[PDB]
A paper describes a structure:
The series V front-runner, however, was 3h (S, S). This analogue has outstandingly low Ks (0.007 μM) and inhibits CYP3A4 nearly as potently as the prior lead compounds (IC50 of 0.090 μM vs. 0.055–0.070 μM for 5b and 7d) and 1.5-fold stronger than ritonavir (Ks and IC50 of 0.019 and 0.130 μM, respectively). 3h (S, S), in turn, was the series V lead compound: KS and IC50 of 0.007 and 0.090 µM, respectively. This is a 3-fold improvement relative to the R1/R2–phenyl containing stereoisomer 3c. Thus, the impact of the phenyl-to-naphthalene replacement in R2 depends on the side-group stereochemistry and is more pronounced when configuration is S/S. Superposition of 3e, 3f, 3h and 3i shows similar backbone curvatures, coinciding with R1–phenyls, and the R2-groups equally distant from the heme but not the pyridine moiety. Since 3f and 3h bind in a similar manner, it was not possible to deduce based on structural and experimental data why the latter analogue inhibits CYP3A4 twice as stronger. On the other hand, 5b (S, S), selectively chosen by CYP3A4 from racemic mixture, and the isosteric and equally potent 3h have notably distinct conformations: the 5b R1 inserts deeper in the P1 pocket, R2 orients vertically to the heme, and the end-moiety points away rather than toward the substrate channel. Even so, the new lead compound, 3h, was among the best CYP3A4 inhibitors designed to date with the highest binding affinity ever detected. Moreover, 3h and other lead compounds most effectively prevented the H2O2-induced degradation of the heme, confirming once again that strong heme ligation and the blockage of the active site are critical for potent inhibition.
In humans, CYP3A4 is the major liver and intestinal P450 isoform with a large and malleable active site which can accommodate chemically diverse compounds. As a result, CYP3A4 clears the majority of administered drugs along with other foreign compounds, such as environmental pollutants, insecticides and pesticides. To further investigate the SAR of ritonavir-like inhibitors, we designed eleven (series V) analogues to test whether the further extension of the pyridyl-linker by one or two atoms would be beneficial or not. Crystal structures of the inhibitory complexes showed that the elongated compounds adopt a more relaxed conformation, which enables stronger N-pyridine ligation to the heme.
Numbering used by the authors:
A (entry chain B): 29 to 195, 199 to 259, 269 to 280, 289 to 496
B (entry chain A): 29 to 260, 267 to 280, 289 to 496
The structure:
C-alpha cells in the first residue's frame, strides 16, 4: 500500500514500513509541510502509517476539493476514533448526518443572531478589563492564555445556553482544557495513526479519546442547562431529529472551540502587538477615533475598524491554529488534470501556504499591511484559508472574528502591552501537535 | 446665503444672485476647476445656485473626507433627483439604506467571483475581434465607442444575470439603444440647469411622477429584469440579490441592476476609447504594450485571471489614461454636520468637492501633466504617487464598487484586441482630442481610428 504515490508518479519522502512518514513529525506538522513544500514542489504525497495523504497547493485544485466537488467526492475529513457518542458531532459526522446538522446549526451565527450577542458579550468585556486592572495596577506579568481563557468560557456559555459561569478556578475551563490534547508523544493518538484498523475494537469496548469524567462533566451540565432564541433553544425546538445524546455532542464542540481557539489567537495577537509597538499604537489610535471617550463597541463599529481586521487577518496567517485542511476522496476522480484514487486523504497545508515566498514577500515578518484594501486584491482566497472553505468551513467564523475583536477593542482602550524579558522572543511554537507556544505568553500590562 | 465663503475666509469666484457661479460652466466642470485651482490655491469655494460647494486639494484633508470621517460626516453625495424608484440605487441611497446595500453587493466583486467571469468574458473577447476583423479587412475608419459598447453590454448582461442578449450582433440591440439614452446631463438643457439652480422644484417633479431617466428606457429595463428573474446558474449579481430576497424588493432589485447595466456599458466603453486614442497617437507605447502581451501570452494565448494581473505595462497604460481622463471628473460628499477637519471648519449642508480632474493634472504633483507618459506608474516611480491625489475610482468605503471588475474587463478587452490588431490615426481622427465642453467627460467628435491586422 506504500507504492501508491510511486504508481501515480507523485513525488514524496520515502516511507518506512508500518510507520510511513510519521517519524518526520519530530519537528511537527508545520515544519514537515514546509520542508516538503520546497523539496517536491506544488503537489506531494506521504503516508500516515498505511494512509496515503496527497498534499495539494494549487488554488484551482484546492477550490475543486473544498468547494465544487465537496458534496460529491470530498465530503468527509479523515476518520477519527474511537469516539463513541461523539460520532454525531458536526465536525465528525459524515455524509447525510452532516448535511442535516450543517443546516440545523447554521442559523446560530446569522447577521441577526450575532447582533443579539453584542450586549451580552459586552458584559464580560468589563470583567476582562477589571480583572486585568488588578494585575496591571501592580507590576505583575499576566498569563494572557489564562485571562483570555476565562473570558472565552463566559461568552460561549451565554451566547449558546444563557448561563453565567466564570466570575478563578472554574470547573468548565479546567475540564475544557483537558478535553483533548493531540500529543504525538502520547502513545495513544500515535498508534491510532499507524494502526487505524484497531479503532473498531475500541468502539465495541466503549472506549473514547476524550476523558470519561470530562465528557460526563459536560454531558450532565448540558442536561442541567436544558431546563425549559440561542444555540440551545434552536435545537430543543427541533427535538420537540435530535436526541439527548447528539445535542450534547454539539455543545462539547462549541464550548471547546469557543474557549480554546479564541484564547490562543488573542494570545498570539497580543504577542505581535507587544513585539511591534508601532502596530499596537497605530491600532490603539484607530479604536479611539471610531469610539471616542472609551465608547462601548457595538456591532457596526467593529466592522468599520479596517486595521483591526488587518491585524487579526495577519495573525491568523502566521498562526493558523488548524495547520491543515483534510478531505477524504470517497471515489475515483480526475480533478484539474490529476487522477486521485478512492481512499486518499487530500490535505491542504494551510501553514505552509500562509508562508509561501511565491505568495508572500517576507512571510516570516509580521506586516498587517498585507491585508490593506490596496493590497488585499493580491491575496488568493484558496491560499489564505484560516477557517477553511467550501460548504464545510468553520461554522463559527463570523462569530469568532467578532468575539475576538470585541476583546481587542476593550483591552487596547485601557492598556498597552510591553515585553517582560521572560517573554519568549521570538515565540517558539510547540513542536508537538496542536499549534501553540512552547512557553506560555507573558507580557507587561500598563494602564492608560 | 451667498456670503458663506466670505465669512469662512475661503476664496472663490464671486457668485451672481440665484445662478451663483453656474455661468462659469461654459467651458465645463474641468476647465472651471483648473482655473480656480490656479487662482485661489489649495482651497476655494463656489455656489451651484444656492448650494455652497467647498473644493479641497490637500491629501490629508481628502483622506479625512473620503476615508476617516465617511460613516460619521461624509456619507452621502449631493442629492440627485427626481429619481422615482431609483432613489434606492446604491449610488443614490443615503445613510442606513446605502450601508445595507453596500454590504449586500460587496461579495459580487470578490477575487473569486471575478475569476469565475474570465471564461465568460473570454467568449465576447473573440466576438469583439471578429467584428473588428470585418471592419479591418477593408480600409475604412471604425467607431470604437460603438464596437466597445456592444462588448461592454454583453459582459454586464452575462456576468450579472447570465443572459446572452447579443448573439454575435444584432447591432441594433435594444439594451444598448435604451441604455445610451438613459441619462445625458447636458447643461444646455433648461431641465438639469433648473435642477441645480432651483432645487426646490424636485419635490414637485417627484409627485408629478417625473424622472430624469425617461420612462421608455426605465420600463424597458424594468420589464427586462422581471423577464430575467425567472431562474428555473452560479452565484452572480442576480443570484445574490435573490438569495437575500427569498429585505429587498422587486424594484430595488431592478434599481441596482440599472446602475450596474449603465456603468458596465458606458464607463467601460468610454475609457477604452480614450486608451486606444492614446495608443494610436503614441505608437511606441502601443508597440511596447504589444511586446509585453506577446511575452506573457505567446502564440496569442487566451488571457486568464492571473496573466492579466502579471502585465505591468498594461496596468500603467490603463492608469495613465485614467489620470488624463477621470470620467468621474469630481468627487462630492455632503457634510451632514458641522466639523473641523485638519484645522478648518465646514458648516452643515456644504458639499465638499475633490477636483479629481484638476488634481490629476496638477503641475505640482506630475511632471508635464498634459503629456501621456505611462512611466509615471512604473514600480520605479509609482512610490511618488499620492493615493489621494490620483483617485480615478474614488476612495474610502464609498469608492467604485466595480473597480476591480472594470479594470479586469478593460484589460481583458485590450489584450484580445492588441493581440490581433494595431491602431493608426485617420486624419478624420480629432488630433488633438477635444473634451466635451458640456456635462459628462466625453470627446467632442467620436474617436475614429484605422485598424490594421497583424
Ligand atoms: C480563530 C478561531 C477559529 C479558527 C481559525 C477556526 C478554524 C476552523 C477550520 C480551519 C475548520 C475546518 C474547515 C475545513 O475543514 O474546511 C473549522 C471547522 C469548525 N469550526 Fe472552527 N475555527 C475557529 C473558531 C471556532 C469557533 C469559535 C467555533 C464555535 C462553535 C468553531 C466551530 C467549528 C466547527 C463546529 C467546525 C466543523 C464544522 C463542520 O465540520 O461542518 N470554530 N474551524
Ligand atoms: C473605468 C471604469 C470606472 C471608473 C473610472 C469608475 C469610477 C467611479 C468613481 C470615481 C466612483 C465614485 C467614488 C467616490 O465618490 O469616492 C464610482 C462609484 C460607483 N461605481 Fe464606478 N467606475 C467605473 C466602472 C464601474 C463599473 C463597471 C461598475 C459596475 C457595477 C461601477 C459601479 C459603481 C457604483 C455602484 C458606484 C457607487 C458606489 C457607492 O455609492 O457606494 N463602476 N465609480
Ligand atoms: C488530522 C487528523 C486525522 C489527525 O485529525 C482530524 O482530522 N480530526 C480533527 C480533530 S477530532 C475532535 C477533537 C476534539 C474534540 C473536542 C475537544 C477537543 C478536541 C474534534 O471533533 N474536534 C472539533 C473541534 C472544533 C474546532 C476546533 C478548532 C477550530 N474550529 C473548530 C477534526 C477537525 C474538526 C474541525 C476543525 C479542525 C481544524 C483543524 C484540524 C482538524 C479539525
Ligand atoms: C454629483 C451630484 C451631486 C450632482 O449627483 C450625485 O451625487 N450622483 C452621482 C451620479 S447620479 C445617478 C444617475 C444615473 C444612474 C444610473 C444610470 C445613469 C445615470 C447615479 O447614481 N449614477 C451612478 C451610476 C454608476 C457609475 C457611474 C460611473 C462610474 N461608476 C459607477 C453619483 C455617482 C455614483 C457612482 C459613480 C459616479 C461616477 C461619476 C460621477 C458620479 C457618480
Amino acid at each position: 500500500s506504500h507504492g501508491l504515490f510511486k504508481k501515480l508518479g507523485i513525488p514524496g519522502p520515502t516511507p518506512l514500513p508500518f510507520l510511513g512518514n510519521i517519524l518526520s513529525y519530530h519537528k511537527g506538522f508545520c515544519m514537515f509541510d514546509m520542508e516538503c513544500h520546497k523539496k517536491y514542489g506544488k503537489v506531494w504525497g506521504f503516508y500516515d502509517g498505511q494512509q496515503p495523504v496527497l498534499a495539494i497547493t494549487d488554488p484551482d485544485m484546492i477550490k475543486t476539493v473544498l468547494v465544487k466537488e465537496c458534496y460529491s467526492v470530498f465530503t468527509n475529513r479523515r476518520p477519527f476514533g474511537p469516539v463513541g457518542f461523539m460520532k454525531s458531532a458536526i465536525s465528525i459526522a459524515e455524509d447525510e448526518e452532516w448535511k442535516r446538522l450543517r443546516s440545523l446549526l447554521s442559523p446560530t451565527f446569522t447577521s441577526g443572531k450575532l447582533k443579539e450577542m453584542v450586549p451580552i458579550i459586552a458584559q464580560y468585556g468589563d470583567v476582562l478589563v477589571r480583572n486585568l486592572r488588578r494585575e496591571a495596577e501592580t507590576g505583575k506579568p499576566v498569563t494572557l492564555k489564562d485571562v483570555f481563557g476565562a473570558y472565552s468560557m463566559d461568552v460561549i456559555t451565554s451566547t449558546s445556553f444563557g448561563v453565567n459561569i466564570d466570575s478563578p478556578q472554574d470547573p468548565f475551563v479546567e475540564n475544557t482544557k483537558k478535553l483533548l490534547r493531540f500529543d504525538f508523544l502520547d502513545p495513544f493518538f500515535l498508534s491510532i495513526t499507524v494502526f487505524p484498523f484497531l479503532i473498531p475494537i475500541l468502539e465495541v469496548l466503549n472506549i473514547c479519546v476524550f476523558p470519561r469524567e470530562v465528557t460526563n462533566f459536560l454531558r450532565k451540565s448540558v442536561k442541567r442547562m436544558k431546563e425549559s432564541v440561542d444555540f440551545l433553544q434552536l435545537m430543543i425546538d427541533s427535538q420537540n431529529a435530535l436526541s439527548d445524546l447528539e445535542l450534547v455532542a454539539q455543545s462539547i464542540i462549541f464550548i471547546f472551540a469557543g474557549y480554546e481557539t479564541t484564547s490562543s489567537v488573542l494570545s498570539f495577537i497580543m504577542y505581535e502587538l507587544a513585539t511591534h509597538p508601532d502596530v499596537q499604537q497605530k491600532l490603539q489610535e484607530e479604536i479611539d477615533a471610531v469610539l471616542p471617550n472609551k465608547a462601548p463597541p457595538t456591532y457596526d463599529t467593529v466592522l468599520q475598524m479596517e486595521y483591526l481586521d488587518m491585524v487579526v487577518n495577519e495573525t491568523l496567517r502566521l498562526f493558523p491554529i488548524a495547520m491543515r485542511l483534510e478531505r477524504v476522496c470517497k471515489k475515483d476522480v480526475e480533478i484539474n488534470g490529476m487522477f486521485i484514487p478512492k481512499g486518499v486523504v487530500v490535505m491542504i497545508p494551510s501553514y505552509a501556504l500562509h508562508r509561501d515566498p511565491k505568495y508572500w514577500t517576507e512571510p516570516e515578518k509580521f506586516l498587517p499591511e498585507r491585508f490593506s484594501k490596496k493590497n488585499k486584491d493580491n491575496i488568493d482566497p484558496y491560499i489564505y484559508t484560516p477557517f477553511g472553505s467550501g460548504p464545510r468551513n468553520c461554522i463559527g467564523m463570523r462569530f469568532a472574528l467578532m468575539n475576538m475583536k470585541l476583546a481587542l477593542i476593550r483591552v487596547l482602550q485601557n492598556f498597552s502591552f510591553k515585553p517582560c524579558k521572560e517573554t519568549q522572543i521570538p515565540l517558539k511554537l510547540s513542536l508537538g501537535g496542536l499549534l501553540q507556544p512552547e512557553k506560555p505568553v507573558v507580557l507587561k500590562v500598563e494602564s492608560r
